[PDB]
Design a protein around this ligand. Structure first.
Ligand SMILES: *[C@@H]1O[C@H](CO)[C@@H](O[C@@H]2O[C@H](CO)[C@@H](O[C@@H]3O[C@H](CO[C@H]4O[C@H](CO)[C@@H](O)[C@H](O)[C@@H]4O)[C@@H](O)[C@H](O[C@H]4O[C@H](CO)[C@@H](O)[C@H](O)[C@@H]4O)[C@@H]3O)[C@H](O)[C@H]2NC(C)=O)[C@H](O)[C@H]1NC(C)=O
Ligand SMILES: *[C@@H]1O[C@H](CO)[C@@H](O[C@@H]2O[C@H](CO)[C@@H](O[C@@H]3O[C@H](CO)[C@@H](O)[C@H](O[C@H]4O[C@H](CO)[C@@H](O)[C@H](O)[C@@H]4O)[C@@H]3O)[C@H](O)[C@H]2NC(C)=O)[C@H](O)[C@H]1NC(C)=O
Ligand SMILES: *[C@@H]1O[C@H](CO)[C@@H](O[C@@H]2O[C@H](CO)[C@@H](O[C@@H]3O[C@H](CO)[C@@H](O)[C@H](O)[C@@H]3O)[C@H](O)[C@H]2NC(C)=O)[C@H](O)[C@H]1NC(C)=O
Ligand SMILES: *[C@@H]1O[C@H](CO)[C@@H](O[C@@H]2O[C@H](CO)[C@@H](O)[C@H](O)[C@H]2NC(C)=O)[C@H](O)[C@H]1NC(C)=O
Ligand SMILES: *[C@@H]1O[C@H](CO)[C@@H](O[C@@H]2O[C@H](CO)[C@@H](O)[C@H](O)[C@H]2NC(C)=O)[C@H](O)[C@H]1NC(C)=O
Ligand SMILES: *[C@@H]1O[C@H](CO)[C@@H](O[C@@H]2O[C@H](CO)[C@@H](O)[C@H](O)[C@H]2NC(C)=O)[C@H](O)[C@H]1NC(C)=O
Ligand SMILES: *[C@@H]1O[C@H](CO)[C@@H](O[C@@H]2O[C@H](CO)[C@@H](O)[C@H](O)[C@H]2NC(C)=O)[C@H](O)[C@H]1NC(C)=O
Ligand SMILES: *[C@@H]1O[C@H](CO)[C@@H](O[C@@H]2O[C@H](CO)[C@@H](O)[C@H](O)[C@H]2NC(C)=O)[C@H](O)[C@H]1NC(C)=O
Ligand SMILES: *[C@@H]1O[C@H](CO)[C@@H](O[C@@H]2O[C@H](CO)[C@@H](O)[C@H](O)[C@H]2NC(C)=O)[C@H](O)[C@H]1NC(C)=O
Ligand SMILES: *[C@@H]1O[C@H](CO)[C@@H](O[C@@H]2O[C@H](CO)[C@@H](O)[C@H](O)[C@H]2NC(C)=O)[C@H](O)[C@H]1NC(C)=O
Ligand SMILES: *[C@@H]1O[C@H](CO)[C@@H](O[C@@H]2O[C@H](CO)[C@@H](O)[C@H](O)[C@H]2NC(C)=O)[C@H](O)[C@H]1NC(C)=O
Ligand SMILES: *[C@@H]1O[C@H](CO)[C@@H](O)[C@H](O)[C@H]1NC(C)=O
Ligand SMILES: *[C@@H]1O[C@H](CO)[C@@H](O)[C@H](O)[C@H]1NC(C)=O
Ligand SMILES: *[C@@H]1O[C@H](CO)[C@@H](O)[C@H](O)[C@H]1NC(C)=O
Ligand SMILES: *[C@@H]1O[C@H](CO)[C@@H](O)[C@H](O)[C@H]1NC(C)=O
Ligand SMILES: *[C@@H]1O[C@H](CO)[C@@H](O)[C@H](O)[C@H]1NC(C)=O
Ligand SMILES: *[C@@H]1O[C@H](CO)[C@@H](O)[C@H](O)[C@H]1NC(C)=O
Ligand SMILES: *[C@@H]1O[C@H](CO)[C@@H](O)[C@H](O)[C@H]1NC(C)=O
Lengths: 132, 453, 113, 132, 132, 53, 113
């Protein structure tokens, strides 16, 4: 879902667009997330906070299936007790600012399941290599 | 197919509200000046004027300038940066001394008072053996009589050694751009009728703020940001009387301010590499410093602000304006800095109005202090050196900081006093638009695809 | 928003010699990611639909000969003609396409003196 | 080899367990390895030492086969002159604290072989794509 | 194209060798790129500049196909308007110092095509998983 | 015949501490990560133009 | 370049007892990446092609018995003999193979006194 258009398509440009349309511009927010006598200390701790946050997010990705995919799929199924709404009414109706609030309570339940499924898939892969 | 599979996405545009430390920046022409002739010229990064912004469609965030951060940060940083331009400067330890003060050579009128005292004193020379006798001119507000003979002293001889403001560094305002680090963004509200509280329907992200010239003015905030089409009054809660009302109007009011006295800066050698810049002669007439506003445009802007104040107080309300109820010097009379010179100008001619619900120029007199107690610290005053020549400057009255009196017992009217108070009301009138948010990637959402093993 | 201000209002010259025109922007249109800049220099005839002349703030359109040059980066931009023709003497426009809202220049009407 | 149990299972919890049982909890030590007027300099250099050590370890992984696997297999065989002991008497007998000492001398002989095998596999992959 | 030789083969050793021969030693420059009362501020900002540059380069890799390959292939074809020269006269004739100048003008045209092809391949992969 | 020091009208003059010495000790200027330092081993090289070694 | 300097010029001893020899380097040959060090201790007979004795600055070659020991790291290096033989009394050499140009030592000619 990308077409020909000459406008800049910049950082947080599609924050209000629906989340089926902001997904076609995710490398922009990924790009503009890292590079940007006493005050050098303040600037320096701001820069190390930036690189620490980037490393924490890349570590959360890396212990899951995707390390540099930027769109990755996994093997845990969507529990319908979490959001109880249709597939058609998320990708064409709501935004990420509005979808963030609706699963913020069910966040950190999902991440443990992601790590659990990735550890189980790693040990299944190790056993499948080991039986050969 | 009704079973969905979860997918985590990186780079997701979504933010939370956050509190971070923004960093200073200056324009490239502001970065062009050097050697600390102004404050911290190489400490801040250079950037463009009017930094780049993009518009965000179909988005609505609630703002609040009153619980906002980064006015606290700007207040703390401007106080500390004011302090850090004083450590190379000269302490007036040897000048706390007995001042033998007589009147200035002038036709003395016994009803009025001379506002200048000609004070002679012993000054230590560059040699630690010999001392000299030297005279200077001080104001009444800077010396007090200690208890025939008439000997004075400075008012700050019992609290601090008073650091001289260095005549190399200037106190002119240069615009600061507050830039966000990586991972954070800054949102600006482009809405017209937005009172700084509640949902803004038209925001835009921007990397740095627009230019904020640091002005220090208690009443009548100068060189500010003009409103778009009408006068906008802004308060945290109108019915609370201990909250200031920030009035920002459309077309600015031109004010002229002057000291017409031609002064002579005279150097006095305190010690090795220690120079005190005193007043020498008053070349010519002894005249009083003052300011002018236009009578007609001030009546026009008062009519505009009464027209806008009647929206929150009913139509049949009599709005009257009276002067300040009392306090210190720089909370009752409006202070500013006209090029290294601190004026205290009387506003009783301005707020003298009543308003019913049916070529001239106001002269307003000023006082001048040489030693100041900015931000009311415990042990840090500041001598300010005299400057040569007649001093005139032109400025724009941008807004007002009003305060309603405690109206009770069937108040048919509601009256409004000017008042400076905290400096943050001066700083909240420029960062009312912006806020700072934390951009958080790694959203998570269901879609109909399982990972192929 | 972004204010696009053309510095002259008109330019009535003779034909054959070169001219130059300028458009200042209230905001630096230089995209730091692409390292390329965002001006559309347009040309509208009397009573006609306009056409592009300069895209990416420097590059001429196909169908436009070598006698035009979009120039400059940052915030201030220059359309320099090398030889004036009788087909050229109508209104030029500068446009930022960096953000919404898309704002144009004032329109410098070049005619023959 | 994971079961149902409600205890916290925290950082360095299985340091004394056998290395066939501490391998089922490796995301815990991977997680708790990065995030945690003059003293800001000391805190700041401690934080940049932390992120520098994390980047050095991720770079040692990345020039090998696994970049975000956290369990990866490779194509160099175990030289039996290194440890000369059975497979059954490592994963059920010893710990990582005790296995660290027994191949600390043969460490940095192994890492060069890992880089050599990964560079050879990269050039074999490039040639196999190139002949197609 | 690697053989038996005992010399150190160190950092920037093959900078003047042809680019078909400096490609066999790329883990050396990848390795020696990260680790290396007032002066601690200067040292500290130099170190955070080093880790920021390393993170920017790894982010440019990661939004493309290769995240830890160090030699990766992609699906955009070489436009012959860029360098208009034979394949035999690059890998056996010129160096990277000389090839850097010849496509420095056509750089940043290529990187957008790399991100475009990687985003298109990610959405094609997502749709191919989604139709199954 | 009374004298003074020549710097009595410009500065209070900081005494060099007799504990610290002013002997030269060799500095090595080391580059951080990502940067390198190139040395020219050429004999007849006047510090301008191409160094071949 | 890298100067390799052997500290004695000759060593004329009796046979049976041990000796020791040293080679200093103008540059630290310890490779920080491999954590292993770069000396080739060679042995040249009169009128013969030389052979290796010590590689990786410590390890003896196959065909060389246990009576040699290359020792030391960093910048200064030591070849220690344990028992002198009649087959051993000819010239030793130290070589850096850390960079180009490959430079050798001066050559300590050990003979029988
Ligand atoms: C609200 O905004 C207005 C608009 O900017 C401000 O008005 C300016 O105020 C500054 C400082 O108060 C003025 O700067 C000073 O101007 C004096 C007058 O000289 C002017 O004219 C000559 C000849 O045309 C110019 O060469 C000169 O640059 C000025 O434009 C000068 O005497 C001063 O210069 C002296 O001090 C500086 C200090 O570093 C030295 O560098 C100089 O060499 C010299 O010693 C100084 O330049 C400025 O002129 C005002 N502009 C206008 C249009 O009036 C208001 O001050 C501001 N309100 C508040 C409260 O800040
Ligand atoms: C800010 O400015 C205002 C006005 O610009 C200023 O208010 C004036 O203050 C003075 C004293 O501070 C007031 O008092 C006057 O003082 C003289 C001194 O002799 C008196 O003689 C005056 O009396 C005359 O007027 C009376 C009434 O008309 C007569 O009955 C009498 O016989 C005298 O003729 C007078 O009391 C002065 O009144 C005010 N001005 C006004 C308009 O009220 C104010 O003080 C300034 N602020 C500060 C902090 O100084
Ligand atoms: C606001 O305006 C009112 C009205 O002008 C001011 O009240 C006036 O204040 C002055 C003092 O500044 C009073 O002057 C008096 O002078 C005599 C002279 O000896 C002195 O002894 C008194 O103690 C007093 O200072 C004046 O009488 C008074 N007038 C009235 C009608 O109250 C008020 O000061 C203004 N406020 C500000 C902040 O300017
Ligand atoms: C301030 O007082 C000083 C005296 O301490 C005045 O200086 C004297 O002025 C007279 C009158 O011209 C001269 O004869 C003396 O020679 C001056 N003495 C010195 C040391 O300068 C001075 O004029 C007074 N100034 C003002 C503005 O009142
Ligand atoms: C010099 O200053 C003194 C004050 O220190 C003047 O003394 C009083 O001044 C006030 C107002 O200036 C008058 O109302 C008083 O009447 C003055 N007191 C006396 C006793 O007259 C003094 O007038 C000033 N002038 C001279 C020449 O001494
Ligand atoms: C400056 O110093 C001189 C000398 O130390 C002071 O003059 C003395 O004043 C007292 C009090 O009137 C007299 O008893 C002394 O006889 C004076 N000594 C001399 C040498 O004149 C003077 O008061 C100081 N201050 C000023 C303003 O001159
Ligand atoms: C500023 O404008 C906001 C609207 O954007 C006003 O807030 C609402 O005021 C009404 C009463 O007039 C309340 O019923 C709403 O609950 C308020 N909404 C919010 C989000 O606070 C606010 O009163 C205005 N403030 C001033 C000082 O005019
Ligand atoms: C303030 O006083 C000074 C005197 O110190 C005036 O400067 C003099 O101006 C005249 C002509 O205007 C010149 O001929 C003199 O050479 C000047 N002297 C000095 C020392 O500069 C100055 O003009 C006065 N300022 C005002 C505004 O009246
Ligand atoms: C404030 O000062 C300005 C000058 O800076 C005055 O503006 C001048 O007004 C006169 C008429 O009185 C005109 O002839 C000038 O051309 C104006 N000059 C400028 C630069 O505008 C202004 O009138 C003053 N206002 C008041 C209330 O005194
Ligand atoms: C006060 O505000 C006026 C606008 O009401 C400013 O005047 C403008 O100044 C800019 C540059 O400073 C010019 O480009 C405009 O043409 C001016 N417009 C008008 C109507 O004069 C003025 O600069 C501000 N400052 C002062 C000290 O007067
Ligand atoms: C230093 O040596 C360089 C050569 O390496 C000289 O540079 C050349 O000088 C000739 C004239 O003699 C010019 O034609 C060349 O264009 C120069 N080349 C460059 C790269 O500058 C240089 O003149 C010598 N300088 C001195 C002071 O002897
Ligand atoms: C999360 O908890 C809050 C507070 O109990 C609740 O209001 C909210 O509905 C919960 N979230 C969801 C998605 O139900
Ligand atoms: C300093 O002296 C003045 C004048 O007597 C007095 O008002 C003030 O209270 C004194 N301050 C202190 C701290 O003693
Ligand atoms: C006051 O009158 C105006 C008419 O201009 C009207 O719009 C407003 O609603 C009135 N307010 C009240 C409180 O009656
Ligand atoms: C208030 O206004 C009147 C008339 O305009 C004026 O005479 C009076 O002086 C003013 N009050 C003050 C305190 O200046
Ligand atoms: C490594 O070297 C030490 C010292 O020579 C030796 O004691 C140890 O046994 C060696 N390691 C192994 C695993 O043999
Ligand atoms: C890039 O531009 C420069 C300047 O116009 C030009 O000289 C150079 O040839 C261009 N690069 C290539 C590879 O053509
Ligand atoms: C200090 O005194 C000396 C000797 O009279 C003189 O040469 C020099 O100019 C003086 N310096 C200053 C700054 O007055």
């Amino acid at each position: 879902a990308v077409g020909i258009g000459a406008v800049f398509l910049g950082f947080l440009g599609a924050a209000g667009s629906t989340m089926g349309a902001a997904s076609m511009t995710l490398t922009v927010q990924a790009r503009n997330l890292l590079s940007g006598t006493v005050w050098g200390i303040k600037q320096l701790q701001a820069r190390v906070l930036a690189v620490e946050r980037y490393l924490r997010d890349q570590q959360l990705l890396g212990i899951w299936g995707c390390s540099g995919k930027l769109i990755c799929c996994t093997n845990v199924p969507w529990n319908s007790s979490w959001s109880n709404r249709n597939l058609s009414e998320i990708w064409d109706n709501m935004t990420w600012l509005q979808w963030d609030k609706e699963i913020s309570n069910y966040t950190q339940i999902i991440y443990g399941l992601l790590e659990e499924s990735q550890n189980q898939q790693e040990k299944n892969e190790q056993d499948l290599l080991a039986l050969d | 197919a009704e079973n969905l599979w979860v997918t985590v996405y990186y780079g997701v545009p979504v933010w939370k509200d956050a509190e971070t430390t923004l960093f200073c920046a200056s324009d490239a022409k502001a970065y062009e000046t050097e050697k600390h002739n102004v404050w911290a010229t190489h400490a801040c990064v250079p950037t463009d004027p009017n930094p780049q912004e993009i518009h965000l469609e179909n988005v609505t965030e609630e703002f609040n300038m009153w619980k906002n951060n980064m006015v606290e940060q700007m207040h703390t940083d401007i106080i500390s940066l004011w302090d850090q331009s004083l450590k190379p400067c000269v302490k007036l330890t040897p000048l706390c001394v007995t001042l033998q003060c007589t009147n200035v050579t002038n036709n003395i009128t016994d009803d009025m008072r001379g506002e200048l005292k000609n004070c002679s004193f012993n000054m230590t020379t560059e040699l630690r053996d010999k001392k000299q006798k030297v005279y200077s001119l001080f104001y009444r507000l800077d010396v007090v009589q200690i208890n025939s003979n008439k000997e004075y002293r400075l008012i700050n001889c019992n609290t601090s050694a008073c650091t001289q403001a260095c005549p190399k560094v200037s106190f002119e305002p240069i615009p600061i751009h507050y830039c966000a680090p990586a991972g954070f963004a800054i949102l600006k509200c482009k809405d017209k009728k937005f009172n700084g509280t509640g949902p803004c329907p038209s925001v835009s992200t921007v990397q740095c703020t627009h230019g904020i010239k640091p002005v220090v003015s208690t009443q009548l905030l100068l060189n500010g940001s003009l409103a778009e089409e009408e006068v906008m009054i802004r308060s945290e809660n109108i019915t609370n009387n201990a909250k200031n009302i920030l009035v920002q109007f459309n077309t600015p009011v031109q004010i002229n301010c002057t000291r017409p006295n031609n002064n002579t800066r005279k150097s006095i050698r305190i010690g090795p590499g220690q120079a005190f810049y005193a007043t020498g002669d008053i070349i010519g007439d002894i005249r009083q410093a003052h300011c002018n506003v236009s009578k007609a445009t001030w009546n026009e802007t008062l009519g505009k602000v009464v027209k806008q104040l009647r929206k929150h107080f009913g139509n049949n309300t009599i709005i009257r304006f009276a002067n300040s109820s009392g306090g210190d010097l720089e909370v009752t009379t409006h202070s500013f800095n006209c090029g290294g010179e601190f004026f205290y100008c009387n506003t009783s001619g301005l707020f003298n109005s009543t308003w019913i619900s049916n070529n001239d120029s106001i002269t307003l007199p000023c006082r001048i202090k040489q030693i100041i107690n900015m931000w009311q610290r415990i042990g840090q005053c500041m001598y300010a050196p005299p400057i040569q020549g007649v001093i005139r400057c032109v400025s724009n009255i941008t807004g007002l900081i009003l305060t309603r009196d405690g109206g009770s017992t069937n108040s048919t009217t509601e009256t409004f006093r000017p008042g400076g108070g905290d400096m943050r009301d001066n700083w909240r009138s420029e960062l009312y638009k912006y806020k700072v948010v934390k951009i958080e990637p790694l959203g998570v959402a269901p879609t109909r695809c399982k990972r192929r093993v | 928003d972004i204010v696009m201000t053309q510095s002259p209002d008109s330019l009535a010259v003779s034909l054959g010699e070169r001219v130059t025109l300028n458009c200042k922007s209230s905001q630096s249109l230089l995209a730091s990611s692409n390292n390329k800049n965002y001006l559309a220099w347009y040309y509208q005839k009397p009573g006609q639909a306009p056409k592009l002349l300069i895209y990416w703030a420097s590059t001429r359109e196909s169908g436009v000969p070598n006698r035009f040059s979009g120039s400059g980066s940052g915030s201030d931009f220059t359309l320099t003609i090398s030889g004036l023709q009788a087909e050229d003497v109508a209104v030029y426009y500068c446009q930022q396409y960096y953000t919404t809202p898309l704002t144009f220049g004032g329109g410098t009407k070049v005619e023959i003196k």
